[PDB]
Design a binder for this molecule. Structure first.
Ligand SMILES: [Cl-]
Ligand SMILES: [Cl-]
Ligand SMILES: [Cl-]
Ligand SMILES: [Cl-]
Ligand SMILES: [Mn+2]
Ligand SMILES: [Mn+2]
Ligand SMILES: [Mn+2]
Ligand SMILES: [Mn+2]
Ligand SMILES: [Mn+2]
Ligand SMILES: [Mn+2]
Ligand SMILES: [Mn+2]
Ligand SMILES: [Mn+2]
Lengths: 440, 440, 440, 440
């Protein structure tokens, strides 16, 4: 499953439909990024630029011109063919092949952008530009507008109105096409296979980073070369650090390990968390905390549907958590009073759900306190957790336990589809999986 | 093998020894780097900052103060302990633990750098600063100097002399300690194991990125979490692109595959290239080109020693290459005349050797045309190659062949030590290795 | 004559009337400007900021908030009262007095602008900002918008639409109120008195800068402390340099002197040019060129009216010039063919007319080739000239003659009013004036 | 009196003498400065650039190259000859004429500075640059150094050492040549004539700005076109504001007026303050305060000599002031105790003396608390004052009196020479001068 040229074209047209007549939208590629000295990190295209192109080169700009209500066209600026640059650093699409390959009307050399961009903006009423997204982009746009403003003797005029297209584009990205959902489904499957593998490989004495290695290898074998975010492998007390990425410790017999990892497949993020015993068997204390987090997730998965909200479902989770923590003596008092005091917050301090897509923390308006009403096509995570610090004033057997369990779902007409349920999460199923692996 | 606190301290002292009395050296950490939106790439410390600290956090500055010829001390600015920031994003060293952990005299919060740095520079004659290394660093230094310049009514004075410490520090980095050589030896071993694995795993129909996956997994299992540069897996015509990193193609029965990959182990780079038949058997044409590249490497390995130079050894390689290409009918004419015309350059267009260390293309002065006389402690690669383009005007059977073979060496009193000879390169040994793997 | 608080308020309201509901307009003061080291040039307020405030301090920002179609209000950010700063550098209006003094609703300290501006923009749809006008202003606005964009967890939202208010404001400035015309009339009178004085004071052997001194003293005595642009006193060959401001030469018996000077009175520019003989008597050659320039001006003054254009009147001037130059043998050929070839351009190389107001080259759209149809309330200059270079291929007696004659006019319902006719320009009147002065 | 080409050359050579062998010094011209929209303030050259060139154009850079201890040469970058630019905006020196005119070895177009500067710095050990002086200059220098740093393959090397030449150059400027003293003497005379004129012209009912007009006209007639700083005309309570420049009030019968004004003559500043009765007669209260300030000045003029300091002489002034204020009942208590409490500070809140030269507040190190020992060739002001605020808790008759009296002196072998004593300051002489003028 992938996103095709025709879908990128549909997206461009959908943006154009929303634009004022006599306008242009400017969408800039990500800059290359230094890792150390003359070496660069592996290139990651800007998500919005990718969304409209599927084009994985830097020094590229998509220009959508809406001349009036019926006439519109697209111009791509991108790197020229250059034999020497290509022998050294890789092939470039160039100008000749770009119109057919990407489905744009015209392509020009990026080297000519300052000589050409102002000519494309001349006489328009509106420019759509994500001001502040990239310094190099702001420089180019500001220079073009200045040339126009100062060019009345050459009969040039600048568009007086600049509109940030990010809100419009992010609202588009918030609602996935069936093709996007298919890509995210595959990302979920790939990510789930990696998590199953980590559970089957984990043994006391392995380092946290060893499970990262297994996970990243599994991503790669299915064609997801890169993770969508830095892998978290937090064993023991490290599980109480939310985005622990050091992954530097030897995993101890008797500790839990929390793994938060996701692949990036055709630009889209998977995002799964599983927590499990390093030695394949939950202790009683570990199981007691685990059960509360799992009940929170299972209830959320029953509830998520069009017409509810992340806020509403969070309320149900908070009650489950406070109730369970009271039962274990971690919290003390009346459940309703404790809920009113947000007494869960020392142990569950983050959100239940974030949007998921071309970014792991995907774009799109949540509403105040994540109250926005859910509709079909939205994709989100469900990630309750409980984190009991090593020095927490709680019964001693719970100290240093960090548990999160996270699935990715899509809202459907009739509820939700769980994209990541192919990796187990019921404690008896986790134990059975690990027992079977440990016998090999 | 690693670099210890005491060695980082020795390095700091060695720099101080070279500094003028009444001076301070300022060494800044790398900024964190965005991958997409709110997600960051895995952190990579600045090599020079790492060299003097072994400290892997951003928002840190090492200040070495040489008050006079006997008195000197060190101050680290680094991120404060903060419970909330740490629960979310990871532990921080903080100020209390830094002096003992890192072996610095004093530690202050990075948040106080603008309030404190000018006080440390006040009245000094010289400041050592790598101007232009980082924008955020230049801002801090320039602000401090401005406060001093403009502060005569407060009895403040700025050092009038600013010296770039990069030349001094890079000359230090050019000559490895025995401990650094031990780390590089391990990096070589790890990298060699990964390359052997790639050869043993490679089959027709696998994707180029599959070998990347095997390699990166092997790095990880030995505790080298990250590669030192983006892995190159160039099969068939892709092998003729020097830093081909797309690694997106299905590897064909009958093609060669060129793999250039290296681990980063305790900050240090391995860097190996091996080229081999995807199907385990060189064709005659492939073997003919391979033999020339291998003879070039083997001769270079015999020759490299104190008192010669990369330029001198390159001359020997150029003769081997021109001679071999003439014999195959790829070049035509008198060998000496062809050498004088640099007739090899269409097929061997890069340098034979680069320095190796905390960066894969390591720091240090090469001399004009890489003529600097070699001395013990220098570490460098040896990477001859021949690249015959698909459209080259040569006998047809050689078109589309890209071959490079690369080892990492250290110059010793008596010649050189090859750090990467534990992965095979003789064609009969490559074939035997692959035959044995293909039978499993 | 001046502009009052109530008029500044009317202007603010007129802008608000043009703004979208749910918007704010941001108008920034000019920065102070270094002359040398710690000394500054005399402060000149930004013309647009002045237009809406009559407030002559730096570090001030006018914010007009249009909450909806009936509700709007104004906030001024300006420097706080500060005893010490004021003892040293002068009084400040401060926050307490500003609402009554300026007629704004609220005033806040400029020091609080970053803490307050984002709160004023929060939830609005549109921000009107002159992007690129001042770096310090862009920094403030961009920072506020960034806080809002990144503040969804604090329920903050940024206006997505940014509109340059310069086109709207400059169209306002293009049409003068009766009060503005009264101020410009006084500027014209003051400027004319200064030019009359220069003619009456000029003698051979005086330096060009001496006439500048007389002019600037005359401006000052009528309460126009500063010129509206750098005074030009170009005698002899210097008159052929359009904006010659060196004014460093001894004025020679037998040369003409061209004086282009104007006062700045209550923010508004006068702009007069007169050219006259240094010794009080035009030579025949000088008179021959002068007559052509004067006929050009006199004809233009008869013609300028609503319904014509600067382009149309320029056409008449070009014919007068080509005809006269042909008669003197400076141009050769058929007048109509010469006009078609723009053969006047070596001798008359600038525009006939520019808008006049708070800037000498005032704001406002001219139309292609200054073709915009004139309407009552527009104020413009009329400044034909002929400049015959020292090395021009023309009859020798004309070489080194530079003549311009310039008046300021306002377009009225019935034609135009000349604001600067109280300084003579007929050659016999110039001679009579100078003869009378030279007898004293 | 002026500074000649040969003196500018001597200065360049004196700097070169102080430079390390294998170095270059870069001295940049001031940028042009916007007044409003497309109009600029009258150009003021950077004082340090002027000091080494006497060249009054922007877009110019002086490069002094010290190849070794015997060989050195100079290169000027400056604007090219351009017929069109010159017809419009004025003549340019250009490259052909610059070597002879300025006495530099070579001249190149400013447009070529980025193509040429790095070539001049290549292989040098040291660059002298005033970092942070001008943004445009920093950009040029940083770009050149970057080209060199990154150009090892082209055999380029950057100087590692950057030295701020400002301390060396400012120490040069601190000690005036006899020719500089002659120029400053003329500036003093011109400034004194202007102050005498202001006293002779002043009448009740004139505006403060009228005296500014008289002063500026007097500067101009002697060939000092511009003031060295913004003229202060502070009548009545305005005299209690130190740098009151509004000069907007009608001068009242019975008030004092304080005038602080100085010309700029050949780059050098005059700086005189005189305070006098608007109506020509000091009141008793006014005279009582005046006498203390005058005694302070007269004593300082007797004392200033080589071997004392501004700090030492200030001590004498403070005693005079405290003693006088006690006698009038403005201060109460023991004089020595009051001195120890710095009880004068509410009434005399600024320094007695600043250096004077190419800047009114001239460059040069003062020492802690202006304790530097004075030597021949130093030029400084002497400017005691007393400022009794309108609301001061003092006998009512002294409220609202602001008095300063300021002369410019040069330290000589035998004491000092007063450059500004040709304008009167004894109260009886001021009265006599004004009485005589008021009778005309
Ligand atoms: Cl390009
Ligand atoms: Cl901090
Ligand atoms: Cl303020
Ligand atoms: Cl130029
Ligand atoms: Mn998540
Ligand atoms: Mn997650
Ligand atoms: Mn290499
Ligand atoms: Mn390599
Ligand atoms: Mn004009
Ligand atoms: Mn004019
Ligand atoms: Mn002074
Ligand atoms: Mn003064």
């Amino acid at each position: 499953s992938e996103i095709s040229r025709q879908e990128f074209q549909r997206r461009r047209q959908a943006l154009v439909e929303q634009m004022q007549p006599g306008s242009a939208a400017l969408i800039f590629a990500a800059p290359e990024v230094t890792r150390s000295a003359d070496s660069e990190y592996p290139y990651r295209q800007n998500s919005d630029f990718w969304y409209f192109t599927g084009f994985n080169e830097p020094e590229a700009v998509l220009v959508l011109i809406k001349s009036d209500d019926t006439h519109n066209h697209s111009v791509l600026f991108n790197r020229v063919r250059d034999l020497t640059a290509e022998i050294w650093f890789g092939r470039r699409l160039g100008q000749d092949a770009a119109p057919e390959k990407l489905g744009v009307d015209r392509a020009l050399a990026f080297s000519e952008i300052n000589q050409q961009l102002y000519q494309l903006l001349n006489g328009l009423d509106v420019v759509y530009h994500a001001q502040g997204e990239y310094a190099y982009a702001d420089v180019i746009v500001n220079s073009a507008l200045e040339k126009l403003r100062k060019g009345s003797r050459q009969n040039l005029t600048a568009p007086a109105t600049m509109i940030d297209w990010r809100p419009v584009v992010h609202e588009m990205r918030l609602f996935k096409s069936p093709e996007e959902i298919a890509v995210l489904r595959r990302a979920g499957e790939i990510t789930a296979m990696a998590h199953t593998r980590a559970m089957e490989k984990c043994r006391p004495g392995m380092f946290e980073y060893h499970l990262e290695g297994e996970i990243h290898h599994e991503f790669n074998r299915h064609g997801a070369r890169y993770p969508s975010y830095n892998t978290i492998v937090g064993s023991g007390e490290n599980g109480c650090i939310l985005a622990y990425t050091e992954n530097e410790c030897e995993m101890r017999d008797g500790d839990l390990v929390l793994i938060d990892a996701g692949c990036e497949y055709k630009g889209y993020a998977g995002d799964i968390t599983r927590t499990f015993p390093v030695n394949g068997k939950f202790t009683q204390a570990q199981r007691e905390i685990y059960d509360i987090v799992l009940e929170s997730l299972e209830t959320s998965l029953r509830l998520y549907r069009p017409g509810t909200s992340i806020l509403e479902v969070t309320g149900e989770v908070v009650r489950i958590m406070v109730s369970g923590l009271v039962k274990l003596g971690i919290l003390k008092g009346d459940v309703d009073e404790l809920i009113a005091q947000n007494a869960h917050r020392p142990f569950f301090m983050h959100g239940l759900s974030h949007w998921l897509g071309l970014d792991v923390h995907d774009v799109g308006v949540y509403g105040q306190d994540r109250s926005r009403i859910l509709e079909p096509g939205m994709v989100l995570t469900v990630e309750p957790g409980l984190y009991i610090a090593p020095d927490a004033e709680v019964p001693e057997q719970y100290r240093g336990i960090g548990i999160r369990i996270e699935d990715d779902i899509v809202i459907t007409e009739t509820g939700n589809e769980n994209l990541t349920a192919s990796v187990v999460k019921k404690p008896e199923e986790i134990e059975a999986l690990m027992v079977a692996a440990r016998k090999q």
